[PDB]
Every structure is written in structure tokens, then in C-alpha cells.
Amino acid sequence: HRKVLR
Amino acid sequence: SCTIHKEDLQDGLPVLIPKEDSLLYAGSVRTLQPPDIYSIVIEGNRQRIYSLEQLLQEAVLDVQPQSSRYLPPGTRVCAYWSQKSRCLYPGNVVRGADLDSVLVEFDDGDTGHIAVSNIRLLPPDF
Amino acid sequence: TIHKEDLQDGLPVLIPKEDSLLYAGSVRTLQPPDIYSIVIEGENRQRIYSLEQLLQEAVLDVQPQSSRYLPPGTRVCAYWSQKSRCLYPGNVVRGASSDEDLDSVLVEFDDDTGHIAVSNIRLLPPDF
């Protein structure tokens, strides 16, 4: 589960 | 404290449920004719049948705070991280350096400001 | 076991196919009264069911929490091959190796005994 990058 | 009680498990109750990824997903309780089993419509939307006992242990009420007033540092929360994902990530509010956003340190090591409308409350010891 | 009231869109069920094995799927309601379709996890062309057929053939799709919820004698079906999506009926048993494992059980299948992960078990009505 990849997560959106900030 | 967002912990679910048996008496409240009624049709349409809004909950958050963990999937096998250690993340939370918003869902709704659907009662069935047999007592003590429920279908959770989990956000597309798919269903999974749960026993009463597993729901009591694993699910929490879906509670969106109105403001940051009672989300001081230390408060246990989960949060939508992006508009592109329906998963909620657990963490804690931390002190920064705003009535409509809080700074959250997530269990997975990320830190970011979260709009209060994207916060959901969690039980302190969740 | 399935009540007509509960036949709403997305209800998780198990249904038999022409091979006398069970398959997991979900109920799809249609606009006309008394007809439903089942969408099968994996597989393609669906089949349309009357309410009567569905109640007579389908069961709820229910995964037990742990082996503690699976005493010997419990009617179950199970995934077997990691390649296939059919579920095979049987009953939970204790064996020599039943000698604390929350996460697996022994299943004496109808067709003979296998060691099955609880996540691969689905409950059946007792008189299935």
C-alpha cells in the first residue's frame, strides 16, 4: 500500500 | 469514546473498520435477519460479513469533529491523507510552532497538517 | 439461511456451480422484482436467479474470526489450491497435530483431511 507523497 | 456498544449496532450506523493493511476505512452497518451478524458496507463499496464480537473488537464509530478545539496535542486520531484515497491513517495530534487544521504525526512515520473535516476521532488506546 | 430481506446489492454469498463446488460472489439486484444476478470473484457471463432459486442455493459468505470459533464438527468449506477459487465442503476435526494455533484448523473434507488457514475457511449451515 503505497501512499501519496508530500 | 467512539468505542462501539452492542445496543448501537443498528442499520446505517457509520463506522470505521480496519482492513488487512492496518489502515481504516469508513463503512456502514447493515443488520441482517440473523441476530449477531452484520454486513459492513466498506468504502468502490464492497461488503464483508462480521460477527457481533468481531465488530465490537475491531470497529469504531465514525466521528468527525466540528473544530480543532478538542483536538489538542496528544489527541489520538485517524485522517484522510489525500483526496485520492479512502484509507484513514492512525496517528496523534502534535504541537506545531488554527481552528480548521491540526498537525498530525502518523503511526507510519509521516507528519502532515490535516483539515479538521478530514479528521476522525479514535479511542485513546486504539 | 439467507432471508429475502437481506438480498440487497453487494451481499456476499457463496453459490454452487455445475461442479458441485462453492464459489464466492455478491448479489446484484435488478430492476424487475424477483430477479437477481450473482457477480463471482474472478469468473465473465453472470447468471440471473429468481428469489426462490437464490434462497434455495446460496448461503452467506462468512469467514470465522479464529480457530476458537471452529470447534470439531463445525460445517465449513475451504479454498484448497492457491490457483483455484472453488471452495470444498467438509467439517472441522481435531487430529494428532491438534496438539494454541489461532490461525489454522484441520478439515476432514467430504471428498481427505487437510490443514487449512482460518482465513481460507467459510462457514456453512450445519445441514449442508
XYZ file of N, CA, C and O in Angstrom, chain C residues 29-70:
168
model
N -28.865 -6.856 -7.359
C -30.284 -6.669 -7.569
C -30.491 -6.063 -8.947
O -29.641 -5.310 -9.439
N -31.603 -6.437 -9.567
C -32.004 -5.918 -10.861
C -33.296 -5.131 -10.683
O -33.949 -5.243 -9.648
N -33.664 -4.329 -11.673
C -34.886 -3.530 -11.554
C -36.176 -4.364 -11.453
O -37.024 -4.066 -10.612
N -36.340 -5.405 -12.292
C -37.600 -6.139 -12.130
C -37.657 -6.909 -10.818
O -36.622 -7.370 -10.320
N -38.862 -7.045 -10.251
C -38.984 -7.797 -8.999
C -38.636 -9.263 -9.219
O -38.831 -9.768 -10.331
N -38.100 -9.902 -8.184
C -37.888 -11.350 -8.140
C -36.679 -11.824 -8.939
O -36.421 -13.020 -8.999
N -35.915 -10.918 -9.540
C -34.709 -11.391 -10.205
C -33.422 -10.722 -9.742
O -33.364 -9.521 -9.469
N -32.384 -11.539 -9.702
C -31.078 -11.172 -9.177
C -30.014 -11.739 -10.066
O -30.248 -12.737 -10.752
N -28.824 -11.162 -9.992
C -27.677 -11.762 -10.631
C -26.636 -12.010 -9.547
O -26.710 -11.428 -8.459
N -25.674 -12.882 -9.823
C -24.545 -13.033 -8.913
C -23.263 -12.691 -9.639
O -23.026 -13.164 -10.747
N -22.457 -11.829 -9.030
C -21.168 -11.454 -9.578
C -20.102 -12.263 -8.872
O -19.948 -12.131 -7.663
N -19.388 -13.109 -9.609
C -18.416 -14.011 -8.985
C -17.014 -13.400 -8.946
O -16.537 -12.852 -9.941
N -16.368 -13.480 -7.784
C -14.981 -13.046 -7.657
C -14.126 -13.826 -8.655
O -13.940 -15.035 -8.514
N -13.637 -13.129 -9.678
C -12.930 -13.764 -10.778
C -13.859 -14.088 -11.936
O -14.124 -13.240 -12.794
N -14.361 -15.320 -11.952
C -15.246 -15.794 -13.013
C -15.990 -17.053 -12.576
O -15.439 -17.884 -11.847
N -16.815 -12.329 -16.521
C -17.469 -13.374 -17.299
C -18.989 -13.289 -17.196
O -19.520 -12.506 -16.409
N -19.684 -14.093 -17.997
C -21.147 -14.054 -18.033
C -21.792 -14.460 -16.702
O -21.511 -15.526 -16.154
N -22.658 -13.595 -16.189
C -23.395 -13.891 -14.963
C -24.596 -14.775 -15.249
O -24.955 -15.006 -16.406
N -25.232 -15.233 -14.176
C -26.480 -15.962 -14.279
C -27.580 -15.216 -13.514
O -27.347 -14.706 -12.424
N -28.776 -15.149 -14.100
C -29.904 -14.496 -13.440
C -30.716 -15.503 -12.642
O -31.058 -16.562 -13.152
N -31.006 -15.161 -11.388
C -31.711 -16.041 -10.455
C -33.043 -15.441 -10.048
O -33.145 -14.228 -9.869
N -34.048 -16.298 -9.891
C -35.266 -15.923 -9.202
C -34.938 -15.838 -7.713
O -33.929 -16.391 -7.264
N -35.778 -15.151 -6.948
C -35.631 -15.134 -5.492
C -35.600 -16.560 -4.930
O -34.782 -16.884 -4.062
N -36.500 -17.403 -5.431
C -36.637 -18.775 -4.942
C -35.341 -19.565 -5.128
O -34.866 -20.217 -4.199
N -34.763 -19.499 -6.325
C -33.521 -20.209 -6.645
C -32.386 -19.755 -5.736
O -31.593 -20.559 -5.238
N -32.295 -18.442 -5.546
C -31.226 -17.890 -4.707
C -31.336 -18.371 -3.277
O -30.333 -18.730 -2.658
N -32.554 -18.386 -2.745
C -32.720 -18.755 -1.355
C -32.412 -20.243 -1.196
O -31.905 -20.683 -0.169
N -32.696 -21.000 -2.248
C -32.559 -22.445 -2.206
C -31.097 -22.854 -2.384
O -30.665 -23.870 -1.843
N -30.310 -22.051 -3.093
C -28.956 -22.471 -3.454
C -27.820 -21.721 -2.737
O -26.776 -22.311 -2.460
N -28.009 -20.436 -2.447
C -26.918 -19.630 -1.904
C -26.863 -19.680 -0.379
O -27.849 -19.994 0.300
N -25.694 -19.350 0.151
C -25.534 -19.164 1.586
C -24.734 -17.881 1.795
O -24.079 -17.391 0.874
N -24.797 -17.323 2.996
C -23.974 -16.160 3.292
C -22.485 -16.547 3.243
O -22.117 -17.696 3.528
N -21.646 -15.584 2.862
C -20.195 -15.737 2.837
C -19.660 -15.236 4.174
O -19.611 -14.019 4.379
N -19.262 -16.156 5.063
C -18.836 -15.779 6.412
C -17.522 -16.440 6.796
O -17.425 -17.666 6.867
N -16.519 -15.604 7.030
C -15.187 -16.041 7.435
C -15.092 -16.004 8.965
O -15.359 -14.971 9.567
N -14.734 -17.132 9.593
C -14.617 -17.127 11.057
C -13.430 -16.305 11.542
O -12.423 -16.151 10.845
N -13.555 -15.795 12.763
C -12.539 -14.940 13.359
C -11.236 -15.695 13.666
O -10.152 -15.169 13.464
N -11.353 -16.923 14.168
C -10.176 -17.699 14.575
C -10.578 -19.147 14.759
O -11.759 -19.487 14.650
N -9.606 -20.002 15.054
C -9.883 -21.425 15.238
C -10.736 -21.663 16.475
O -11.371 -22.704 16.609
N -10.776 -20.688 17.373
C -11.605 -20.846 18.578
C -13.094 -20.846 18.245
O -13.927 -21.282 19.057
N -13.411 -20.333 17.059
C -14.789 -20.268 16.548
C -15.102 -21.461 15.645
O -16.142 -21.512 14.981
N -14.209 -22.446 15.670
C -14.295 -23.627 14.812
C -14.100 -24.927 15.602
O -13.117 -25.641 15.393
